[PDB]
Design a protein around this ligand. Structure first.
Ligand SMILES: Cn1c(=O)n(CCCO)c(=O)c2c1nc(Oc1cccc(OC(F)(F)F)c1)n2Cc1ccc(Cl)cc1
Ligand SMILES: Cn1c(=O)n(CCCO)c(=O)c2c1nc(Oc1cccc(OC(F)(F)F)c1)n2Cc1ccc(Cl)cc1
Ligand SMILES: [Ca+2]
Ligand SMILES: [Zn+2]
Lengths: 104, 666
């Protein structure tokens, strides 16, 4: 016979593909495209915060990948921190901690 | 000629200069030139789309090792020859293999499917994508399987079959596939570790690979225990059963990494010191005083729970530490009885009631305890522990002593040497030796002497492996000395024959005396004049002397120091990680004393809804565990890692592609 393999622990929900496009946009550094996605969030088709496959939030992609423009972009438009200052401390960066002042 | 001519004997394939320019532009990550080259390749030109380098670097494969998503999209757009490039994207550990999923010699084994290479590379996202596409791994056969078709496949290609089984077992033992596809990854890790151990036992070749796989599975189980963060989660995991049933399973499957976990040892120390706080915090003299007064007052707690089990004194035996203290107090009382038994003149001895009559039942209680151990575990569990073997021979000697005393009862310097009294006394002495050597197994509970005893216990195998070679050397030299020295066997005027006399004589007359003399020659207890015969034959005396000398050289100078060196290396390898072995042995002792059976020391022992709730609780807590575990290995793999040549190639090629894109724009 042949053993059948399947995702017995698939807790991650696919939801919409636009979440995946937005999460890829945070991983590429397109500031204006993520601004457009936040304008769409203001429209309301897709949410600001989406936990990915790796169990991480968008601000964690801003912090761990160490770029501050998109982090200031979601901080201007409003976003869910969800234990993100500890992640900023974890990356040993000073600037993102300073804007954050202005799983574990 | 004085010059070696050089040429390519295996010239392989060759490329056109336009094909070389195409491949070089693909390596540079160029948009415009590569797109133009494929556009002229659409019409009839020299440039072939499926150009393969003699290095096996197709433009498809080069772009896979180039990781440029736009370039690989361009190449799949005009339908290049897709061969094994999916497996190359799997090996490169790039998430861009989904593009190939949405769409000559081979570097990989023909057995390797994408899931096997994905499990080998141990990337969570790649394996998740592959199992989301819908993929079933081939079934490996059993460790002692009997299949006619698999036997015939071994007869056709044994090498390909063995490589196939190794690849399948390497795919199954991957931690990501276990965490992603298994119902119970702890049970799967245990069963897979046992299967890999038995596979390494059966397959003497490829043993290192299977041992590495088993250690990787054990490390995965230990890491999954590391990810826990609550005593409630530990109580859910270790008490799960389909009572610390999972900890029993870890004990049985020999998971020393799982068992010696600091959190698991925290739970075990909490359960062992049942309602006994501050025992380590108090002073050493104070805690030894408390241990001495509990062990001295042993009969009052052991008489309780036999008449009044619900009494607080009856419930004092419920604590496993008090049970261990009572058991060891009973054993030192047995050894005290043996000591007073060591400290008349009749053919058959009446039973010495004063000190040697209360030993009889205590031995009977020991026999009952060993019978209860025989019932709990079968024959392999009893023969697995060497201490159960020592207890078995101790009880056999004690039963033989009792039987010989009875035979003497129903039936000095005058009795035959085969009188049952003398043999009974000798058997009692050897049983006393074994019973008092039984105390060295109680050092596992202590922290200072535990690793010492465990290291000795698992270096005894190397000691025996050396003593086999010593046995062969001893037999050879004894045979030689027998053949040389047995014509001078003295028979007249000897008040004492053998080496065990005040004046040593007849040391090498027979084989048994030669074995004894060559054994005692190690410790220097055989004098030099045992090689001097009464006759004048000085040549045979010299040959015996030089044969004794050469043996003494081989035993003392060569083999003994070889044993020292082998012990040095073995103790290095053992005390590299002997602490986990000691904690495993201490957990075995503690959990043997955790059972409700055997609560009495050897003196005085002579539903579907609940299962569904436990299953859902274990499932939820272990979704939490695997989420923490994959977060941890993603975090770990992102740091303390060398970039090496491939990362520099990607980083430089991105700047090259950016420069060419800017030059195209401007
Ligand atoms: C414990 N012991 C012992 O007491 N005597 C004295 C008996 C009366 O003198 C012995 O002669 C005696 C003995 N073990 C013995 O074999 C060993 C084998 C392997 C290792 C070893 O250890 C070391 F490597 F040598 F250190 C010793 N032999 C020798 C022997 C005697 C009879 C027979 Cl059939 C076979 C072998
Ligand atoms: C095996 N052997 C021996 O049996 N006898 C006893 C013979 C009757 O007494 C010996 O005297 C004897 C002997 N090997 C001997 O030289 C060794 C050389 C190197 C190593 C060694 O080993 C160790 F380092 F010592 F361990 C020993 N010598 C000494 C000797 C005696 C006479 C002569 Cl001409 C030359 C050398
Ligand atoms: Ca036992
Ligand atoms: Zn088979």
């Amino acid at each position: 016979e042949v053993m059948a393999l399947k995702d017995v622990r698939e807790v991650k929900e696919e939801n919409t593909l636009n979440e995946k496009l937005f999460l890829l946009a945070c991983d590429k550094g397109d500031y204006y495209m993520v601004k457009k996605i936040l304008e769409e969030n203001s429209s309301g088709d897709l949410n600001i915060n989406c936990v990915d496959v790796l169990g991480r939030n968008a601000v964690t992609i801003t912090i761990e990948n160490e770029n501050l423009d998109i982090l200031q972009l979601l901080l201007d438009y409003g976003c869910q921190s969800a234990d993100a200052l500890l992640v900023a401390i974890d990356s040993e960066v000073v600037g993102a901690v300073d804007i954050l002042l202005n799983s574990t | 000629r004085d010059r070696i001519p050089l040429r390519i004997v295996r010239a392989e394939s060759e490329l056109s200069p336009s094909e070389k320019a195409y491949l070089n532009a693909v390596e540079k990550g160029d948009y415009a030139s590569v797109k133009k080259s494929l556009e002229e390749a659409e019409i009839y030109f020299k440039i072939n789309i499926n150009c393969i380098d003699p290095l096996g670097r197709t433009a498809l494969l080069i772009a896979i090792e180039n990781e440029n998503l736009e370039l690989i999209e361009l190449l799949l757009s005009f339908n290049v020859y897709v061969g094994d490039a999916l497996l190359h994207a799997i090996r490169k550990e790039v998430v861009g293999a989904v593009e190939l999923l949405l769409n000559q010699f081979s570097e990989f084994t023909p057995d390797i499917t994408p899931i096997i290479l994905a499990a080998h590379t141990n990337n969570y996202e790649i394996i998740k994508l592959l199992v989301q596409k819908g993929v079933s791994v081939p079934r490996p056969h059993e460790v002692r399987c009997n299949c006619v078709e698999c036997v015939s496949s071994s007869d056709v290609d044994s090498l390909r079959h063995s490589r196939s089984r190794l690849n399948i077992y390497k795919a199954l033992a991957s931690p990501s596939l276990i965490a992603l596809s298994s119902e119970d990854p702890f049970l799967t890790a245990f069963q897979l570790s046992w299967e890999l151990q038995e596979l390494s036992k059966v397959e003497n070749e490829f043993k290192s690979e299977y041992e590495e796989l088993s250690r990787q599975c054990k490390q995965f189980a230990k890491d999954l225990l590391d990810q826990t963060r609550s005593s409630r989660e530990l109580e859910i995991i270790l008490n799960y059963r389909d009572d610390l049933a999972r900890l029993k399973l870890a004990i049985k499957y020999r998971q020393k990494e799982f068992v010696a976990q600091p959190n698991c040892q925290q739970l075990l120390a909490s359960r062992w010191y049942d309602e006994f706080p501050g025992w380590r915090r108090r002073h050493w003299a104070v805690k030894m005083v408390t241990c001495f007064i509990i062990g001295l007052l042993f009969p009052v707690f052991s008489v309780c729970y036999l008449i009044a089990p619900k009494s607080p004194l009856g419930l004092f035996i419920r604590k496993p530490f008090i049970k261990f203290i009572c058991h060891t107090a009973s054993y030192l009382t047995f050894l005290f009885l043996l000591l007073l038994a060591s400290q008349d003149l009749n053919r058959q001895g009446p039973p010495p009631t004063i000190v040697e009559w209360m030993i009889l039942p205590w031995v009977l209680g020991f026999i009952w305890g060993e019978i209860k151990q025989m019932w709990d575990g079968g024959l392999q569990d009893y023969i697995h522990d060497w201490w159960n073997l020592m207890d078995f021979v101790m009880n056999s000697l004690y039963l033989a002593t009792i039987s010989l005393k009875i035979v003497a009862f129903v039936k000095r310097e005058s009795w035959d040497m085969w009188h049952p009294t003398l043999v009974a006394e000798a058997l009692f002495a050897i049983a006393n030796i074994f019973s008092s050597l039984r105390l060295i197994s109680l050092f596992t509970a202590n922290s200072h002497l535990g690793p010492l005893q465990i290291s000795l216990g698992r270096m005894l195998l190397d000691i025996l492996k050396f003593l086999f070679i010593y046995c062969l050397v001893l037999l050879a030299f004894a045979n030689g000395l027998n053949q040389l020295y047995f014509y001078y066997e003295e028979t007249k005027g000897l008040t004492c024959k053998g080496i065990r006399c005040e004046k040593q004589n007849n040391a090498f007359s027979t084989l048994f005396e030669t074995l004894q003399s060559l054994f005692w020659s190690i410790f220097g207890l055989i004098n030099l004049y045992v090689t001097n015969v009464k006759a004048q034959h000085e040549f045979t005396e010299f040959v015996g002397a030089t044969m004794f000398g050469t043996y003494n050289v081989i035993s003392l100078v060569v083999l003994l120091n070889m044993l020292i060196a082998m012990m040095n290396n073995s103790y290095q390898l053992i005390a590299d990680h002997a602490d986990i072995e000691w904690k495993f042995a201490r957990t075995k002792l503690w959990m043997s004393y955790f059972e409700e059976g055997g609560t009495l020391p050897t003196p005085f022992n002579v539903r579907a809804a609940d299962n569904l709730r436990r299953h859902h609780q274990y499932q939820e807590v272990m979704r939490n565990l695997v989420k923490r575990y994959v977060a941890a290995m993603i975090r770990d793999a992102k740091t303390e890692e060398g970039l090496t040549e491939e990362n520099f190639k990607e980083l430089k090629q991105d700047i090259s592609s950016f420069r060419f894109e800017v030059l195209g724009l401007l």
